[PDB]
């Protein structure tokens, strides 16, 4: 968890829902070394779980 | 000279023993109240 306001916070007991949305477009979530534009070679799937 | 091949019967166990990992503490269900959610169904490995 990366937000600064939750990263580190302290829960009580109770039921809570926690939501989040990723990224699947490949060339923001995964750094090459040359950048060649992934996005246009080809990758990422599935977030199977 | 052919002939019948061995008759395997396939079907579910009786009273389902299987589906329903009894047992197996890892994988073991829960019957706690909602708002303690703790638990209330503590499973062995020495029982079946």
């Known amino acids: 968890?990366?937000?600064?306001?939750?990263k580190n916070?302290?829960?009580?007991?109770?039921?809570?829902?926690y939501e989040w949305n990723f990224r699947k477009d490949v060339n923001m979530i995964?750094?090459?070394?040359?950048?060649n534009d992934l996005?246009?070679?080809g990758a990422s799937v599935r977030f199977d779980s | 000279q052919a002939a019948?091949?061995?008759?395997?019967?396939?079907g579910f166990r009786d009273n389902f023993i299987g589906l329903?990992?009894?047992?197996?503490?890892?994988n073991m269900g829960v019957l706690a109240g909602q708002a303690s959610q703790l638990n209330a169904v503590v499973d062995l490995q020495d029982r079946n």
Do not use: E, H, W
Request: glycine residues 8%; charged residues 10%.
């Open chain 2, 20 to 26: 329903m990992y009894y047992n197996s503490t890892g």
């Open chain 1, 30 to 35: 995964l750094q090459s070394s040359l950048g």
């Open chain 1, 39 to 41: 996005r246009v070679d």
């Open chain 2, 4 to 10: 019948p091949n061995r008759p395997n019967y396939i």
């Open chain 1, 9 to 17: 916070l302290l829960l009580l007991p109770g039921s809570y829902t």
């Open chain 1, 1 to 6: 968890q990366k937000f600064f306001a939750i």
